[PDB]
Design an enzyme around this catalytic site. Structure first.
Site, PDB file in Angstrom:
ATOM      1  N   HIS A  83       0.854  -1.182   0.000  1.00 40.94           N
ATOM      2  CA  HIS A  83       0.000   0.000   0.000  1.00 40.94           C
ATOM      3  C   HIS A  83       0.899   1.245   0.000  1.00 40.94           C
ATOM      4  O   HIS A  83       2.113   1.126  -0.082  1.00 40.94           O
ATOM      5  CB  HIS A  83      -1.102   0.012   1.087  1.00 40.94           C
ATOM      6  N   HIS A 148      -7.444  -1.339   5.590  1.00 34.91           N
ATOM      7  CA  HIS A 148      -6.546  -0.358   6.182  1.00 34.91           C
ATOM      8  C   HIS A 148      -6.362   0.847   5.286  1.00 34.91           C
ATOM      9  O   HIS A 148      -6.230   1.973   5.766  1.00 34.91           O
ATOM     10  CB  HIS A 148      -5.216  -1.055   6.469  1.00 34.91           C
ATOM     11  N   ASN A 179      -4.575   3.686  14.286  1.00 34.61           N
ATOM     12  CA  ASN A 179      -4.689   4.674  13.195  1.00 34.61           C
ATOM     13  C   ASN A 179      -5.434   4.156  11.958  1.00 34.61           C
ATOM     14  O   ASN A 179      -5.018   3.218  11.310  1.00 34.61           O
ATOM     15  CB  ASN A 179      -3.317   5.208  12.775  1.00 34.61           C
TER      16      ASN A 179
HETATM   17 ZN   LIG Z   1      -0.512   1.901   6.306  1.00 42.01          ZN
END
Ligand SMILES: [Zn+2]
Length: 227
Positions: A83, A148, A179
């Site tokens: 990512h 995510h 987060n």
């Molecule tokens: Zn990340």
């Protein structure tokens, strides 16, 4: 005996053998008062290596390449970032300097550009829709959907049934989401279910951060992300 923040010396990167031709790599950074670790993967193919994720920044990635040459002694020729965040693409320019052909999905390249992060040089085609899979040397790369991050990929090594979940999958000891600034919390459970359905024979599941487990990490992640 999996490496942790409590035993990796400061600035060092470690490798851990997972199965035949498969290692994880573990690196650290201190942010505020807390030391964090991040995992990636290394997979052998013939006499070369495929790298999954940088070692979280340029300095750690230089250390990673040295550690690979010391412990394995085969060249990294290609990489995949799973990512767009620093722990996945930070260090791509080090990889490019070292002659590695760097890849990710088109969406990851766009998000990395938008974020002002380093951008892998090449796009993986046919990964644009949830459920898309492509073979890449010794691995399958699967886009399971948003979790995510909108772009997150997982990587499976079919010969040895190793699934690298990246940050779409949490370690067992993690009980809060933390987060989620780029997350799709609504789609995350469906994305997990797609991973479960696709890789039912996986023996080892490696989370993006923390200790390896098995397929139980998938449902664990859903439980935490709801929580
Ligand atoms: Zn990340």
């Amino acid at each position: 005996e999996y490496p942790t923040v409590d035993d990796i010396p400061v600035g060092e990167v470690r490798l851990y053998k997972i199965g035949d031709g498969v290692w994880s790599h573990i690196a650290t950074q201190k942010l505020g008062d807390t030391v964090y670790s991040s995992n990636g993967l290394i997979v052998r193919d013939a006499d070369e290596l495929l790298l999954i994720d940088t070692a979280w920044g340029a300095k750690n990635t230089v250390a990673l390449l040295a550690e690979i040459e010391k412990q394995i002694g085969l060249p990294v020729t290609r990489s995949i970032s799973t990512h767009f965040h620093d722990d996945r693409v930070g260090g791509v320019d080090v990889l490019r300097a070292a002659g590695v052909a760097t890849y990710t999905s088109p969406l990851t390249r766009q998000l990395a550009e938008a974020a002002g992060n380093e951008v892998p040089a090449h796009s993986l085609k046919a990964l644009s829709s949830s459920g898309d899979v492509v073979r890449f040397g010794p691995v399958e790369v699967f886009y399971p959907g948003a979790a995510h991050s909108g772009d997150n990929l997982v990587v499976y090594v079919p010969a040895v049934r190793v699934l690298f979940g990246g940050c779409a999958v949490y370690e067992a000891s993690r009980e809060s989401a933390g987060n989620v600034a780029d997350a799709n919390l609504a789609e995350w459970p469906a994305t997990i279910k797609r991973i479960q359905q696709r890789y039912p024979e996986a023996e080892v599941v490696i989370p993006g951060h923390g200790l390896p487990g098995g397929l139980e990490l998938l449902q664990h992640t859903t439980n935490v992300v709801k929580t």
